[PDB]
Amino acid sequence: SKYERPLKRESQIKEFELGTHAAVIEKVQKKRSGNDMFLLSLLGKSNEKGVYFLTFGNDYTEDNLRYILASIQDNGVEIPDVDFGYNRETFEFLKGKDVYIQVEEQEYKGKVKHAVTNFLTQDEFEES
Amino acid sequence: SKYERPLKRESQIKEFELGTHAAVIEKVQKKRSQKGNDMFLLSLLGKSNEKGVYFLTFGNDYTEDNLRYILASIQDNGVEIPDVDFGYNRETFEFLKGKDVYIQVEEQEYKGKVKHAVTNFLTQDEFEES
Ligand SMILES: [K+]
């Protein structure tokens, strides 16, 4: 057969549209950049797919996890008295928790994506 | 203008087809039956945006086993089951939310008319068999 540039595969994977969304942290995976990381897979109400990298070791680590925990808290889950950080308690705790999320567009290397940027509180979600 | 019947629209409420599906427990709602049994109503969202429901009834002989089946399915989708007494309580209500499961849809009869209904929660093995 004469070669013919094939059509792009998985063009119709559901991604989040711009704005705020009620989502679930469907999955959590361990990763490494040097930096220790949790990869958070996010699932939308219409099976939209997004990801968020929680990076440990830096200055924003504590705050970034707090917002996640507050968003979980505001989706009707009690935050226990655990030492939250790069540990197994946290890894397990984040799996299958409802959240509010913010989705903005993000340029990288020419093309544009829809990136999950922040985890929102009840108040910040209701604003939008 | 003279009347012409508009074509049937699409159900934005797309129901589950028959057979087996992977889904997530999207929502849990506190209810009470007509008899007076406490109930959890589980909204299930399939991978193709299908939407079904399930009534977990407490205070009968089928309650304890029904939870095992749900909690086993949650366990096999990679979530550790905590050390709590499961029942009509905050800890159960909160835990079930947001969890991936395997379900089995079948034909049932509501007031005589047939409908697609979520019947069982499958372990990993059972899912693959289908
Ligand atoms: K029409």
Residue numbers in the entry:
A (entry chain A): 1 to 33, 36 to 130
B (entry chain B): 1 to 130
Task: Quote the study that presented this structure, word for word.
Here, we characterize PrgE, a proposed SSB from the Enterococcus faecalis plasmid pCF10. Structurally, it has the characteristic OB-fold of SSBs, but it has very unusual DNA-binding properties. Unlike other SSBs, PrgE binds both double- and single-stranded DNA equally well. This shows that PrgE has a quaternary assembly and DNA-binding properties that are very different from the prototypical bacterial SSB, but also different from eukaryotic SSBs.
We solved the crystal structure of apo PrgE to 2.7 Å, using the AlphaFold2 model of PrgE as a template for molecular replacement. The asymmetric unit contained two copies of the protein in the space group P212121. Both copies were modeled from residues 1–130, with residues 34 and 35 missing in loop 1 of chain A. For both chains, the remaining C-terminal part (residues 131–144) is missing in the density. Two PrgE molecules are found in the asymmetric unit of the crystal, potentially showing a dimeric form of PrgE when it is not bound to any nucleic acid. PISA analysis shows that this dimer has an interface area of 680 Å2, with 9 H-bonds and three salt bridges. The overarching fold of the protein corresponds to an oligosaccharide/oligonucleotide-binding (OB) fold, characterized by five beta-strands that form a beta-barrel with a 1-2-3-5-4-1 topology, which is only partially closed between strands 3 and 5. PrgE also has a 42-residue-long region between strands 3 and 4 that forms two alpha-helices of which the first seemingly contributes to the opening in the barrel between strands 3 and 5. The apo structure overall aligns very well with the predicted AlphaFold2 model of PrgE, having an RMSD of 0.48 Å over 113 residues.
